Ligand binder design. Structure first.
Ligand SMILES: CCCCCCCC/C=C\CCCCCCCC(=O)O[C@H](COC(=O)CCCCCCCCCCCCCCC)COP(=O)(O)OCCN
Ligand SMILES: CCCCCCCC/C=C\CCCCCCCC(=O)O[C@H](COC(=O)CCCCCCCCCCCCCCC)COP(=O)(O)OCCN
Ligand SMILES: CCCCCCCC/C=C\CCCCCCCC(=O)O[C@H](COC(=O)CCCCCCCCCCCCCCC)COP(=O)(O)OCCN
Ligand SMILES: CCCCCCCC/C=C\CCCCCCCC(=O)O[C@H](COC(=O)CCCCCCCCCCCCCCC)COP(=O)(O)OCCN
Ligand SMILES: CCCCCCCC/C=C\CCCCCCCC(=O)O[C@H](COC(=O)CCCCCCCCCCCCCCC)COP(=O)(O)OCCN
Ligand SMILES: CCCCCCCC/C=C\CCCCCCCC(=O)O[C@H](COC(=O)CCCCCCCCCCCCCCC)COP(=O)(O)OCCN
Ligand SMILES: CCCCCCCC/C=C\CCCCCCCC(=O)O[C@H](COC(=O)CCCCCCCCCCCCCCC)COP(=O)(O)OCCN
Ligand SMILES: CCCCCCCC/C=C\CCCCCCCC(=O)O[C@H](COC(=O)CCCCCCCCCCCCCCC)COP(=O)(O)OCCN
Ligand SMILES: CC(C)CCC[C@@H](C)[C@H]1CC[C@H]2[C@@H]3CC=C4C[C@@H](O)CC[C@]4(C)[C@H]3CC[C@]12C
Ligand SMILES: CC(C)CCC[C@@H](C)[C@H]1CC[C@H]2[C@@H]3CC=C4C[C@@H](O)CC[C@]4(C)[C@H]3CC[C@]12C
Ligand SMILES: *[C@@H]1O[C@H](CO)[C@@H](O)[C@H](O)[C@H]1NC(C)=O
Ligand SMILES: *[C@@H]1O[C@H](CO)[C@@H](O)[C@H](O)[C@H]1NC(C)=O
Ligand SMILES: *[C@@H]1O[C@H](CO)[C@@H](O)[C@H](O)[C@H]1NC(C)=O
Lengths: 1277, 173
């Protein structure tokens, strides 16, 4: 009675939160900064140690000494241990910088007690555990798949690259003596061979930096030294982290094609597809939750207040207020910003809205006011802004209230409000996920804090704010490897593997589960409710026996003819080629050819090879303009210009065609010899760069892609408005609190703006990663520069435009950590909250809304948006059975002892598991680079010879034991034969030639066998099919993304071809040719600092030399051009069009990956039916007669069992179904399989209304005729 | 009327004909009209006409010149180790950068007005020239996060870099 009260449990929960807070303050640095806190936290500990001890003895005295009680007792134990340890620490006995504080590691777990009440759901615990087991098995499978790809690319990186140890240094660098002052600026890699990589210029030599005394500890952790380093590097790259500069090193050290192929395929497979498979898994988890939840069951002042004119006036006042507050831009170091006219405007608006709230209260009473749940937010704003206007909380955290008033503006658009209610759903799915995310972040920060607060020279976990910033940064992925690297260096060499496992596991969970849950929650909010889907449709033992029982208990004239002929001309064993050749009219085929040739020509245009001065580049231009003039004239004469239903201008595509034609015609007629920067001629060249967009109109698959993408533009635009509103809120706040406060002296030893003059010796960046800390008595490279009081040049909050640009750059999470650090170091640490909140609201939620709306519109275009999850699973099963074929296993021979025993040997699961282990082991043989001057490569190649001889005997066994004819039946067997023949070829060459290309061929054969490993595992094969079939299904989407990228690449060669080298524009990334521009634009969406590149391309005087005549002589950048170009490209590609790849991966995952459900025909059932059909169909026809059907049905065992003890009626129904289907003959393995699938599900759930009525009519007819024949057998006797 | 590089304070002690060794665009006539090292600060050109004080000021000029030379050697050492020196700009080469940087540094050490210049330019403008012709050199980012700042910049937050009372020295470009 003393512990079951209502208030006591709330007390225990609040005290669990308080204990979390207590342990989050218990670090040595926190006690150095605030000594009182020490005793404070002790007291709290003691107090809680009392109370919880009570709730243990006051409870385990009732019951004799729920599986929460053991947890609560371990918590009490942790509290007691922390108490006695802190008593020892108070008495100065323990150092407090010793690892004893690690005993407080479990204490944060007490936070679970504060939320344990919210662990009661509407589903029984059995259904919850079934959901969790299904999701766990799927996550295990996808993790195995991920590990397969990681090992594949790790071996490829070991063999295609090596160590990046050759650097350009000054030639007078003696061995053993290299210093910071011998390297180049910036540090650059090179190749010692005259044909690969970067060649050092005169004055520099390419040295090894390993014969020179440098250690692989002061040279990084990345690279491809051995298989472990390489796997870690591949995993880092799959997060789009640090792979671009690794690629730059590879390009400088090795041939270029290697790096391009390697890293582009790594980003495409690992960073896009394999990553999207995890999102598919979480979306399937939510689909399974749905399936489980479904199968479980004044007299006049009031009138003027009610008028819409008053609402319009108040919303206009909110608009004016927030616009005026946002427009308080920085005006210089000689103004006040404290009691100025903006403050008086703020006072006036605060008084106005306080009067509005008072009036609403005085009209509707108080309780009727406050019940509105929107008047609650308005009263919160009234109070917060009134406190804000008090002239000591002006321009403080209280400003958050003022800038929040823009939320009221959501009531101008009913559609935006409905979209908000739709996409954010209930405050119990998304809100619960946000609370779980905050709690997980707090607990992991507290745990990492207790792990690392004592470690010397590690300022990432000294206090809870720092530990939380570190864990949040790992969540956002921006520089997470840097956090882990600093920690790994700090902890030492013995514990580094354990903390590396910790950080990798945390990153894996965070980025592959938490963010995927955000996506899945948004998608579930956008997906119609199951009951609503069924209601909207209405407005318009063995599983066979279970379904049978359910089914039972339920019972003028001329020259237009010639033009029309020419523009409509078009155009079976091989009908695929004939459909490819008749895809478009001959006129469109010619025009596609001419478009492609013109784009290929434009790929040679550069600032120094111009189309206006080079005739070979004008060939394609003249051809394009002439042929498009002919095409337009023909189509306009034939199909009319505007009026005709198939006129030329009837959609946006024809308008764009006319636009492109006119641009190219004006350019070719003009052909200006001088093109000034930012002129109309350069704008004309940029518009001419839009020529690839004609492929989007001439190819119907591209038209389909564009049409389906723009079918969801309303939702895309509403998400854009929500993100703009968020950025406006935070940009107004940033202008009010940060304007003029981000500047400081570029000399770190200066503090006051009055001391910031003269010159100082600045240190220049040599190597960001390399750690040649060795400096005997010399200083770091640098030189003398003026002291300047400057903004960071990449972002400021001085006006609302700069603030919105900075927040848009932070939204991409690229370089956001530098913004965070600048705001915390130059304004104050309290203003870290600001940036973090934005990063949580804009990236984890904001961009996830784009992901969700794009996937939802995709699913709506393919038609599956109004189907229930059971109906969608039925469609996926019906597609899975439409491609299943009879099994490829010929029978075992009779009394052929040389083949029967060999049959039992090759078909025994021990043999297959042994072959898979051998594939993995030969794969492991490629762990060190197979060189030709390395000794270990000879043992490795000899063992590879042993392996390929083993696989030779395996293949000969499977060919003689099975058949030479039947061995060729399996495609996997054919691949294995191909790889084994390549293997024996390599063996005879390797012992004959023994060259370096011999080792290359051996490594290649090993890689192809490793790739064979994917056919020896069910889940691996299903996931590989998912990936490759979704890559096939995304061909035209990838073509469209490439077409957009090509347009942008041409435009960027025109705009940024000669931009002065800057922070990120350099010899590795620039727009000096179309190929360089293409590679740069690819890297800009897959893990490079695109905003740094944007700010390099915005360079203006006095940082460049303008030219008044031509752009190729001007060295400068386009400011507005760079803004529009980079922002629009990043939005279009990274936020919109890659989510199409996500949508396709999700579709194909639900199609190909099958789990053994209870109420559906599964993969094992398909295999069992295949075995039974193999035994019934003798000569392997794939088609049996009618009586073999009853034989097969009697034969089926397991889950397809039809036992003649309780389900004889079912047997007769199925046999008569197979009789009736073709008037009595020759069913075809899909008739019987379709019959099984139908008789194996509850058709009321799985089928749609048309198919349901058809099937129920069919089954009623069958049952009636079976009853008729039974009655006739009776009347016969 | 040709130049006369200064070598000894005593030997040279028509001042518009004696140029400094490294900062070879400043005559002694111009230095005595404005420059004065504070320790020996008595040289307002009234120490040459009316000579130990002169030796003290000319040796101060030579020390200024020598320190400017050391700093310039550090700069050209950085510029030598810059490998993209031939690619960074279609308009500027390392020699242009070197010349304008030497002019800027020499103006930092001798903040005086130059006379008898064919073409004249505000001396502060040489700062801007270093921003224009020299390559972007990323500064090291351990103590302070520079953002996207370059190593050499001239004008701060909300400042008109060119103002009144400028030395307005020669133009050598
Ligand atoms: C990027 C946005 C991510 C920010 C997430 C913030 C958040 O979640 O707060 C949610 C608030 O969401 C909002 O952003 C509402 C505020 C929108 C302000 C609209 C400003 C009006 C601008 C005029 C637009 C012109 C309309 C033109 C359209 C044709 C709260 O969720 P809820 O309303 O309670 O719904 C759940 C029901 N229990
Ligand atoms: C930072 C704060 C963010 C909160 C802002 C979100 C607004 C709504 C808050 C979310 C919310 O209240 O959801 C409620 C609370 O959310 C949760 O369930 C908590 C999530 C579990 C966190 C577990 C923490 C331990 C994890 C570390 C290991 C959901 O409960 P309910 O369904 O409404 O009631 C069930 C009683 N039958
Ligand atoms: C890491 C975690 C280490 C220890 C976690 C402490 C778990 C406490 C176990 C208590 C327990 O077994 O609760 C049992 C069930 O346990 C639960 O369901 C736990 C509640 C879910 C909380 C969700 C927290 C998961 C957060 C994921 C963590 C991911 C971070 C990984 C980063 C490296 C209650 O079952 P019962 O005993 O049958 O209840 C009725 C009996 N009358
Ligand atoms: C690592 C990155 C992965 C690369 C992307 C994944 C590669 C996917 C693998 C193979 C692609 C297979 C292509 C799928 C074929 C789809 C079949 C189809 O629907 O098209 C059938 C015909 O096939 C076609 O549509 C051919 C496409 C028309 C011409 C293509 C024009 C695009 C031009 C490419 C851009 C050129 C660049 C410009 C020059 C630099 C339709 O037949 P129908 O009965 O007439 O209707
Ligand atoms: C968000 C950023 C998305 C970036 C996507 C950019 C794609 C390149 C611009 C597309 C120009 C190609 C125009 C193709 C086109 O006209 O698609 C037609 C209309 O598509 C559109 O609505 C696009 C209009 C806005 C595009 C900007 C599809 O109609 P249809 O298949 O021909 O059906 C005929 C009877 N109704
Ligand atoms: C809500 C946005 C209200 C626009 C505030 C305009 C205040 C303003 O003049 O910003 C000026 C610059 O800011 C802008 O250009 C406004 C751009 C607004 C874009 C966001 C929508 C500040 O003058 P400055 O710093 O001397 O150059
Ligand atoms: C490179 C990747 C090579 C793929 C090897 C593992 C493929 C296993 C798989 O996904 O399903 C298998 C797909 O089969 C294939 O198509 C393997 C591809 C080989 C094509 C023909 C072999 C000669 C040319 C290579 C199913 O095999 P089956 O049912 O016995 O007929
Ligand atoms: C996430 C999806 C929706 C988000 C919308 C993305 C675009 C909105 C985000 C940021 C736009 C910021 C507006 C740029 C104003 C720059 C502030 C400023 O004071 O610069 C001033 C601007 O002066 C100018 O001449 C720039 C005028 C060009 C305006 C360009 C704005 C369009 C940006 C295109 C973005 C399109 C996004 C993708 C939509 C498909 C001058 O400063 P200065 O240093 O003296 O030269
Ligand atoms: C609930 C509490 C916090 C509300 C506080 C409101 C008070 C403190 C605010 C509201 C109006 C404000 C005043 C408005 C007018 C002026 C005159 C001006 O020349 C200086 C500021 C000054 C003197 C303000 C002082 C602070 C002020 C009096
Ligand atoms: C079959 C027809 C329609 C296609 C060929 C069109 C002919 C007329 C086109 C194609 C290539 C064109 C040439 C391409 C290059 C040049 C160099 C330029 O400085 C003058 C025009 C000139 C000489 C063009 C003249 C017209 C031209 C010869
Ligand atoms: C290293 O280089 C410095 C600089 O020239 C030189 O003084 C020193 O003797 C060298 N030491 C060795 C071991 O080469
Ligand atoms: C280094 O290279 C420079 C320029 O080629 C040359 O003058 C110098 O003598 C070289 N020093 C060596 C080779 O030690
Ligand atoms: C440059 O690095 C040195 C270390 O050699 C350090 O002492 C100095 O403070 C740094 N200078 C600047 C301006 O960062």
């Amino acid at each position: 009675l003393w512990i079951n009260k209502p208030w006591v449990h709330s007390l225990l929960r609040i005290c669990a939160i308080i204990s979390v807070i207590s342990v989050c303050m218990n670090t040595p640095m926190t006690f150095e900064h605030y000594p009182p806190l020490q005793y404070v936290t002790f007291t709290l500990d003691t107090l809680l140690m009392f109370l919880y001890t009570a709730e243990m003895i006051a409870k385990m005295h009732i019951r004799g000494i729920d599986r929460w009680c053991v947890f609560d007792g371990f918590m009490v134990f942790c509290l007691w241990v922390s108490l006695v340890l802190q008593v020892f620490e108070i008495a100065d006995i323990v150092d407090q910088m010793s690892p004893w504080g690690m005993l407080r590691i479990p204490r944060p777990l007490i936070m679970i007690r504060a939320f344990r009440i919210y662990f009661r759901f509407e589903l029984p615990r059995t259904r919850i555990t079934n959901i969790l087991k299904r999701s766990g098995e799927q996550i295990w499978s996808v993790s195995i798949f991920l590990l397969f790809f990681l090992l594949l690319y790790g071996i490829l990186g070991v063999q295609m690259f090596g160590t990046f140890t050759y650097h350009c240094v000054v030639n007078d660098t003696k061995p053993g003596n290299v210093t910071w002052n011998s390297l180049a600026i910036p540090d650059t890699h090179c190749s010692p061979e005259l044909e690969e990589g970067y060649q050092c210029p005169p004055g520099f030599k390419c040295m090894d930096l390993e014969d020179l005394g440098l250690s692989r500890q002061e040279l990084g952790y990345s690279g491809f030294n051995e298989i472990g380093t390489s796997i870690f590097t591949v995993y880092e790259a799959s997060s789009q982290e640090g792979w671009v500069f690794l690629m730059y090193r590879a390009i400088d050290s090795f041939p270029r094609w290697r790096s391009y192929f390697y890293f582009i395929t790594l980003i495409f497979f690992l960073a896009w597809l394999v990553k999207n498979v995890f999102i598919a898994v979480i979306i399937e988890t939510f689909a399974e939750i749905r399936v489980q939840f479904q199968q479980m069951w004044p007299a006049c002042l009031q009138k003027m207040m009610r008028s819409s004119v008053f609402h319009m006036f108040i919303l206009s006042m909110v608009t004016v207020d927030v616009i005026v507050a946002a427009s308080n831009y920085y005006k210089g170091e000689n103004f006040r910003r404290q009691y100025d006219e903006f403050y008086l405007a703020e006072v006036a608006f605060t008084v106005l809205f306080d009067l509005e709230a008072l009036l609403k209260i005085w009209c509707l009473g108080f309780t009727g006011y406050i019940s509105s749940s929107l008047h609650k937010f308005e009263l919160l704003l009234v109070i917060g802004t009134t406190l804000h206007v008090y002239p000591d909380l002006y321009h403080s955290q209280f400003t958050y209230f003022q800038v929040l008033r823009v939320v009221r503006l959501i009531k101008i658009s009913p559609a935006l409000e409905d979209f908000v209610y739709k996409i954010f759903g209930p405050g119990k799915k998304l809100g619960s996920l946000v609370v779980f995310t905050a709690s997980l972040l707090i607990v992991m920060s507290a745990i990492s804090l207790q792990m690392f607060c004592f470690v010397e020279e590690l300022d990432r976990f000294t206090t809870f704010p720092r530990a939380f910033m570190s864990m949040f940064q790992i969540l956002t992925q921006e520089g997470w490897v840097d956090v882990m690297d600093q920690t790994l260096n700090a902890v030492g060499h013995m514990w580094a593997p354990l903390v590396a496992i910790y950080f990798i596991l945390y990153h894996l969970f965070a980025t592959l589960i938490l963010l995927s849950l955000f996506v899945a929650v948004i998608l579930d909010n956008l997906e119609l409710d199951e009951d609503l889907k069924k209601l909207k449709q209405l407005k318009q033992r063995s599983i066979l026996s279970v379904q049978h029982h359910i089914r039972q208990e339920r019972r003028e004239h001329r020259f237009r003819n010639f033009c029309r002929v020419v523009v409509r001309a078009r155009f079976t064993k091989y009908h695929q080629l004939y459909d490819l050749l008749g895809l478009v009219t001959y006129l469109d085929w010619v025009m596609i050819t001419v478009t492609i040739c013109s784009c290929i020509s434009m790929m040679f245009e550069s600032p120094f090879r111009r189309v206006m001065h080079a005739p070979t580049l004008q060939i394609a231009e003249y051809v394009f303009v002439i042929f498009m003039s002919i095409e337009l004239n023909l189509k306009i004469m034939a199909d009319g210009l505007f009026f005709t239903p198939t006129a030329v201008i009837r959609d946006f595509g024809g308008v764009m065609d006319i636009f492109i034609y006119l641009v190219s015609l004006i350019f070719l007629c003009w052909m200006p010899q001088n093109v000034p920067a930012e002129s109309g001629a350069q704008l004309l060249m940029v518009l001419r760069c839009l020529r690839p967009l004609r492929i989007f109109k001439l190819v119907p698959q591209m038209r389909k892609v564009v049409r389906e993408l723009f079918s969801g533009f309303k939702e895309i635009f509403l998400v854009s408005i929500l993100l703009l509103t968020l950025m406006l809120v935070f940009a107004s706040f940033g202008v009010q609190l940060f304007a003029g406060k981000l500047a400081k002296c570029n000399d770190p030893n200066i503090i006051r703006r009055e001391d910031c003059n003269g010159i100082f010796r600045i240190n220049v960046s040599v190597s960001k990663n390399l750690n040649l800390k060795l400096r005997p008595g010399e200083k770091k490279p640098g030189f003398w520069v003026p002291r300047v009081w400057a903004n960071p040049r990449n972002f400021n909050f001085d006006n609302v435009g700069n603030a919105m640009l900075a927040l848009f750059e932070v939204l991409s999470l690229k370089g956001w950590v530098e913004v965070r650090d600048v705001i915390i170091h130059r304004v104050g640490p309290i203003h870290g909250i600001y940036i973090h909140v934005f990063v949580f609201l804009g990236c984890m939620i904001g961009l996830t809304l784009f992901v969700g709306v794009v996937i939802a519109n995709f699913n709506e275009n393919k038609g599956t948006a109004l189907l229930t999850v059971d109906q969608r699973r039925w469609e996926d099963l019906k597609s899975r059975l439409k491609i299943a074929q009879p099994l490829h296993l010929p029978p075992r021979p009779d009394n052929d002892g040389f083949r029967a025993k060999m049959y039992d040997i090759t078909q025994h699961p021990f043999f297959k598991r042994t072959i898979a282990l051998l594939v993995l082991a030969q794969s492991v043989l490629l762990s060190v680079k197979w060189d030709v001057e390395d000794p270990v490569t000879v043992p490795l190649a000899t063992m590879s010879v042993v392996f390929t001889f083993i696989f030779v005997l395996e293949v000969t066994m499977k060919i003689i034991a099975m058949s030479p004819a039947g061995f060729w039946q399996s495609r996997r067997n054919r691949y294995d034969l191909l790889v084994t023949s390549l293997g024996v070829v390599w063996v005879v060459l390797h012992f004959a030639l023994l060259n370096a290309y011999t080792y290359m061929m051996g490594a290649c054969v090993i890689v192809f066998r490793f790739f064979s490993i994917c056919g020896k595992h069910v889940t691996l094969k299903m996931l590989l099919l998912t990936v490759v079939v979704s890559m096939y299904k995304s061909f035209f989407i990838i073509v469209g993304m490439f077409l957009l990228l090509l347009c942008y690449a041409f435009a960027g060669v025109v705009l940024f071809g000669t931009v002065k080298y800057g922070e990120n524009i350099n010899r590795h990334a620039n727009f000096s040719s179309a190929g360089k521009a293409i590679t740069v634009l690819f890297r800009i969406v897959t893990g490079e600092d695109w905003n740094k590149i944007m700010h390099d391309c915005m360079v203006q005087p006095p940082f460049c030399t303008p030219d008044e005549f031509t752009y190729w002589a001007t060295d400068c950048g386009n400011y507005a051009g760079a803004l529009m170009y980079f922002c629009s490209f990043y939005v279009i590609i990274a936020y919109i069009m890659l989510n199409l790849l996500v949508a396709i991966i999700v579709e194909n995952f639900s199609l190909f990956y099958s789990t053994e459900e209870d109420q559906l025909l599964s993969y094992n059932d398909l295999r069992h039916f295949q075995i039974i059909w193999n035994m019934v169909d003798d000569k392997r026809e794939g088609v049996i007669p009618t009586f073999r059907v009853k034989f097969l049905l009697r034969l089926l065992r397991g889950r397809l069992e039809v036992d003649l003890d309780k389900d004889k009626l079912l047997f007769k129904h199925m046999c008569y179904e197979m009789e009736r289907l073709h008037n009595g003959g020759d069913v075809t393995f899909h008739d019987v399989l379709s019959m099984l699938s139908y008789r194996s599900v509850d058709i009321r759930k799985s089928l749609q209304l048309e198919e349901l009525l058809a099937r129920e009519q069919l089954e009623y007819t069958i049952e009636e005729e079976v009853a008729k024949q039974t009655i006739r057998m009776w009347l016969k006797k | 009327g040709q130049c006369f590089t200064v070598e000894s304070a005593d030997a040279v002690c028509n001042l518009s004909d004696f140029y400094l060794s490294f900062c070879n665009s400043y005559t002694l006539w111009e230095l005595f009209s404005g420059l004065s090292s504070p320790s020996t600060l008595n040289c307002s050109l009234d120490v040459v006409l009316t000579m130990t004080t002169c030796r003290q000021c000319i040796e101060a000029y030579q020390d200024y010149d020598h320190h400017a030379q050391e700093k310039y050697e550090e700069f050209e050492s950085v510029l030598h180790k810059y490998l993209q020196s031939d690619e960074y700009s279609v308009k500027s080469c390392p020699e242009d950068c070197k010349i304008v940087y030497k002019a800027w540094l020499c103006s930092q050490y001798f903040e005086v007005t130059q006379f008898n210049c064919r073409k004249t330019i505000p001396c502060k403008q040489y700062c801007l020239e270093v921003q224009t012709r020299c390559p972007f050199i990323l500064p090291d980012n351990d103590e302070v996060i520079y953002g996207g700042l370059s190593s050499f910049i001239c004008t701060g937050l909300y400042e008109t870099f060119l103002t009144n009372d400028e030395p307005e020295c020669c133009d050598i470009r």
